[PDB]
């Protein structure tokens, strides 16, 4: 009926890690190649995603137990979940009023259409928006949102993972924290945890669908040239 | 005492090719990652150079005889001279009054200092400025400036070149055009041609010095990540 001293320490860390790596002002967006509204949004969005990947890496490094993993496993986990963590973290900018990520003014307000001018069809963009709406409607506590990102990241079932025993242990340790936080600190959340886990399944599907659209982009040199080195490397299929 | 019908056709082509690939308004610069004034200028300058490389490729393709070369040779020539063509073409924005490339306002006015915030020392930047001043002082006709770029590009002595017989022929054909244009159309230019050839030698030295500073950048992943795919590929040492 009460969160342990160890469970609250890992929460403090995760919540701080997210504050260190997520800017609510989105002031760094001016440093990206400007948005343009064929495939005009690709450069801006490629920079946005590249920037976010660096942020996700910074966050990951502060996840309790992550640094204790092999460089290989760390990479296998980041490469496989990077896009999912990005999709999760963006919910914080997503707005239900307009069904779009609002990062400031007309420039950094991203609607579903903008992403279609970056090489993605509604065949994939539909589920993503639906996902954001369902995720926003959950009205997650910051503690839960953050815990969800870290649990996503430490998923055992990822291509390339070697020590899927330690990873699952770290993830289980995290799930316990989450299930306990909700039970204790979040009224009416008796059903919440289960809904959050279902969202992880959704992310797998969104991930699969993104990697397919991205594969076409990465295979067209005229488009791939618009990406960044980090994006190409992280979303690339090179094997370590 | 008069330029031939064939010599003037290749001039028309080269001068048009340059007009198609060089914007005096520099209006595309707003689409690059903004300039910042460690290594803050690297992103803007990397985008500038990447953009310029695409332009140089477009120009090259229109050089009489270039398209008739092997894809390999075309690549060997572009990879080896890209930086030299960029250094040549930038003279058109360089200004003696302020000793800097002036592409519009404080933002796109590049001084020697700006480039030092992009990974280059004055140990290399000095000769480059001196080169620009000497080049500007030559007050080249557009026909000569353009001819010089095309002769630089079609230089036989480049690493990777295979058919150095046809290349030299194309270059000789070009040098003749230049020596004849100056003799006929450019008063007091009896010494000009020779001075232009010496500039090509200068470019080799500038090229050598750039590739050394660039090698350090490309070897530091935190810096290399700020480059573009095109830059990395064109200035990279992969062998075809």
């Amino acid at each position: 009926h009460m969160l342990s001293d160890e469970q609250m320490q890992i929460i403090n860390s995760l919540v701080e890690a997210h504050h260190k790596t997520y800017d609510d002002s989105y002031s760094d967006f001016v440093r990206f190649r400007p948005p343009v509204r064929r495939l005009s949004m690709l450069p801006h969005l490629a920079d946005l995603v590249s920037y976010s990947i660096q942020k996700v890496i910074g966050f990951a490094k502060m996840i309790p137990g992550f640094r204790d993993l092999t460089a290989e496993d760390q990479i296998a986990l980041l490469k496989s979940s990077a896009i999912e963590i990005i999709m999760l973290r963006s919910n914080q900018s997503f707005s239900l009023e307009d069904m779009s990520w609002s990062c400031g003014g007309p420039d950094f307000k991203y609607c579903i259409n903008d992403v279609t001018k970056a090489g993605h069809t509604l065949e994939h963009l539909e589920p993503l928006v639906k996902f954001q709406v369902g995720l926003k409607k959950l009205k997650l506590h910051e503690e839960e949102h953050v815990l969800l990102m870290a649990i996503c990241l430490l998923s055992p079932d990822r291509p390339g993972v070697q020590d899927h025993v330690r990873i699952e242990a770290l993830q289980d340790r995290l799930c316990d924290v989450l299930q306990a936080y909700i039970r204790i600190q979040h009224p009416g959340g008796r059903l919440l945890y289960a809904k959050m886990i279902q969202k992880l399944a959704d992310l797998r599907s969104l991930n699969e669908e993104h990697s397919k659209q991205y594969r076409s982009l990465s295979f067209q040199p005229e488009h791939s040239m618009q990406l960044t080195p980090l994006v190409l490397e992280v979303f690339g299929s090179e094997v370590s | 005492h008069m330029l031939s019908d064939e010599q003037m056709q290749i001039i028309n082509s080269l001068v048009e090719a340059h007009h198609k690939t060089y914007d005096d308004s520099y209006s595309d610069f707003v689409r690059f990652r903004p300039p910042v004034r460690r290594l803050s200028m690297l992103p803007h300058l990397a985008d500038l150079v990447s953009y310029s490389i695409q332009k140089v490729i477009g120009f090259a393709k229109m050089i009489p005889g270039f398209r008739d070369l092997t894809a390999e040779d075309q690549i060997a020539l572009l990879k080896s001279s890209a930086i030299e063509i960029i250094m040549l073409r930038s003279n058109q924005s360089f200004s003696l009054e302020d000793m800097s490339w002036s592409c519009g306002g404080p933002d796109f006015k590049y001084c020697i200092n700006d480039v030092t915030k992009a990974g280059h020392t004055l140990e290399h930047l000095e000769p480059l400025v001196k080169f620009q001043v000497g080049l500007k002082k030559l007050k080249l006709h557009e026909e000569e400036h353009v001819l010089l770029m095309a002769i630089c590009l079609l230089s036989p002595d480049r690493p990777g070149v295979q058919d150095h017989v046809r290349i030299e022929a194309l270059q000789d054909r070009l040098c003749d055009v230049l020596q004849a244009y100056i003799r006929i159309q450019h008063p007091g230019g009896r010494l000009l041609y020779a001075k232009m050839i010496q500039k090509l030698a200068d470019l080799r030295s500038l090229n050598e010095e750039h590739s050394k500073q660039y090698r350090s950048l490309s070897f530091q992943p935190e810096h290399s990540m700020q480059l573009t795919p095109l830059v990395l590929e064109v200035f990279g040492s992969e062998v075809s």
Binding site: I75, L230 | E222, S224
Partner: peptide
């Protein structure tokens, strides 16, 4: 070889 990733992972 993931040169950038290794790097960013301190």
């Amino acid at each position: 070889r993931h040169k950038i990733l290794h790097r960013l992972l301190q």
